[PDB]
């Protein structure tokens, strides 16, 4: 990796350039009494102690010949800081950036940014991750229903209709529900209620469904739209669905792992504050 000089001086200059300060603020989920914000970028000795949790004194004060992990880690911490200029950061957010960039515990930019923004806006990042994971998990569940129906026709060399003779993705029974009100409270329903509907006639009455085509072609989901969709497919798309399902499954798996890693980080942060 490259040569560097003092990480302390580098960060001090950056937060000055970008008009950032970093403060410990009261957290109602952790602290017993409310206290005034403690600005740690106003106390260089305290800032050095915080950096020393992650870095050796050598890097903090003098720089040196950094390994690739460290050079890349510092670059990433700087980019996270620069992404939220003119802000009073919470220390927990800055420490999360450090922890999830410099250590063996790694979270990718997409998820780490969600965490950091939550912390900086005085939220509970655990709650934010849970909410995101629930939506992704429900979208994946819907895709698994679609995949199962496709695979049935592929196995039988048959023809799946994804339009007016589609399975109805709004049928609670596809997701294990036996009560409509309970289904309407589900993460699945929250996705499905945003989807286009197709009108079909049953026994001379109109019935609304969410067709496979309605769902797949919709922009209002994490995986985005599939285009050029036909009303039926014969096996005497399935690749695109498999790709989207794999992408979605990856994101869901990473959110899941991020919840475990954030739990551990919060324990570490609490431990470090005790030493401060």
Swiss-Prot record:
GO CC annotations, alphabetized: extracellular region
Alphabetically ordered keywords of this record: Plasmid, Secreted, Virulence
Coiled coil: none
Record flagged with keyword Secreted: yes
Protein's cellular compartments: Secreted
InterPro entries: LowCa_resp_V_Ag, Vir_assoc_V_ag_sf
Top-level lineage group: Bacteria
Biological role stated in the UniProt entry: Possibly involved in calcium regulation of YOP expression, which includes the export process.
Identification of the protein by name: Virulence-associated V antigen
């Amino acid at each position: 990796g490259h040569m560097g000089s003092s990480v302390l001086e580098e960060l001090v200059q950056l937060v000055k350039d970008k008009n950032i300060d970093i403060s410990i603020k009261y957290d109602p989920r952790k602290d017993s009494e409310v206290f005034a914000n403690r600005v740690i970028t106003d106390d260089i000795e305290l800032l050095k102690k915080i950096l020393a949790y992650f870095l050796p004194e050598d890097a903090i004060l003098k720089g040196g010949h950094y390994d690739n992990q460290l050079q890349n880690g510092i670059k990433r911490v700087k980019e996270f800081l620069e992404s939220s200029p003119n802000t009073q950061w919470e220390l927990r957010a800055f420490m999360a950036v450090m922890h999830f960039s410099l250590t063996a515990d790694r979270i990718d930019d997409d998820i780490l940014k969600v965490i950091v923004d939550s912390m900086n806006h005085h939220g509970d990042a655990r709650s934010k991750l849970r909410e995101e994971l629930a939506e992704l998990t429900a979208e994946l569940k819907i895709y698994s229903v679609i995949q199962a129906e496709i695979n049935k026709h592929l196995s039988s060399s048959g023809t799946i209709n994804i339009h007016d003779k589609s399975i109805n993705l709004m049928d609670k029974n596809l997701y294990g529900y036996t009560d409509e009100e309970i289904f309407k409270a589900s993460a699945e329903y929250k996705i499905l209620e945003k989807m286009p509907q197709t009108t079909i006639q049953v026994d001379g009455s109109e019935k609304k469904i969410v067709s496979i085509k309605d769902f797949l072609g919709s922009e209002n989901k994490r995986t985005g739209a599939l285009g050029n969709l036909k009303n039926s497919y014969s096996y005497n798309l399935n690749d695109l669905v498999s790709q989207k399902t794999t992408q979605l499954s990856d994101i869901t798996s990473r959110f899941n792992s991020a919840i475990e890693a954030l739990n551990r980080f919060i324990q570490k942060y609490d431990s470090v504050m005790q030493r401060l």
